[PDB]
Amino acid sequence: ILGEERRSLLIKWLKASDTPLTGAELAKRTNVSRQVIVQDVSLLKAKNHPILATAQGYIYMKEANTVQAQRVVACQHGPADMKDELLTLVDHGVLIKDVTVDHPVYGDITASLHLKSRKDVALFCKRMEESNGTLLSTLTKGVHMHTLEAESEAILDEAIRALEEKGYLLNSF
Numbered sequence: 001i002l003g004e005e006r007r008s009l010l011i012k013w014l015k016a017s018d019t020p021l022t023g024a025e026l027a028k029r030t031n032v033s034r035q036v037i038v039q040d041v042s043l044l045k046a047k048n049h050p051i052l053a054t055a056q057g058y059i060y061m062k063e064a065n066t067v068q069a070q071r072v073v074a075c076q077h078g079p080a081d082m083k084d085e086l087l088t089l090v091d092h093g094v095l096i097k098d099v100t101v102d103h104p105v106y107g108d109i110t111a112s113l114h115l116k117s118r119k120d121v122a123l124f125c126k127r128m129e130e131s132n133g134t135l136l137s138t139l140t141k142g143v144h145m146h147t148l149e150a151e152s153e154a155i156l157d158e159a160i161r162a163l164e165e166k167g168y169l170l171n172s173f
C-alpha cells in the first residue's frame with residue numbers, strides 16, 4: 001500500500017511541476033533513497049506513464065501552448081569544448097533535448113539531457129568530469145547528434161550558425 005501511495009504522489013508532483021524534479025528531491029519528500037525513486041519511476045514507465053529522467057531531474061511529458069521548432073543537428077568538437085558548445089546553445093534560447101552517440105558496441109546511445117539554462121550546463125559538465133564521463137569518447141572523434149528545440153526556425157538557424165562559427169558542426173564532406 002505504501003509503495004503505491006508513494007507512486008501516486010510522484011505522479012501528482014510531476015504533473016503539477018513545470019521544471020524537472022531531481023531524484024534527491026523526490027526521495028526527500030517521501031523518505032526513501034534515490035535508488036527507490038529510480039525503481040518507482042521504472043514501474044510507472046511500465047504502466048505507460050511518459051516520465052523521462054533528464055540530467056536535471058524527472059519530467060512528465062506534455063505539450064506546449066505553441067508548437068516549437070525542432071531540428072536534428074550533426075555536431076563535432078574536441079574533447080575540451082563540450083561546455084562551450086552547450087553554453088552557446090542555451091544562450092540562444094535553445095533547449096538541448098538530447099545527445100546521441102554512434103557507439104561501436106551499443107549502437108546509437110541517446111541521453112535525455114533537457115539542458116535549458118547556463119546553470120544546467122555548468123552543473124552537468126561538472127558532474128560528468130567528476131565521474132568517468134566517457135559518453136563522447138575518442139570512439140567517434142567528437143561526432144554526435146543533438147535534437148534541438150526552439151520557439152522558431154529563425155532561432156534554430158542563429159544558434160546553429162553560432163555553432164558553425166566556432167567549428168562545432170559536422171562538416172559535410
Ligand SMILES: O=C(O)c1cccnc1
Binds near residue numbers: 082
Ligand atoms: O554535447 C556534448 O558534447 C556532450 C553531451 C553530453 C555528454 N558528452 C558530450
Ligand SMILES: [Zn+2]
Binds near residue numbers: 075086099144146
Ligand atoms: Zn554537443
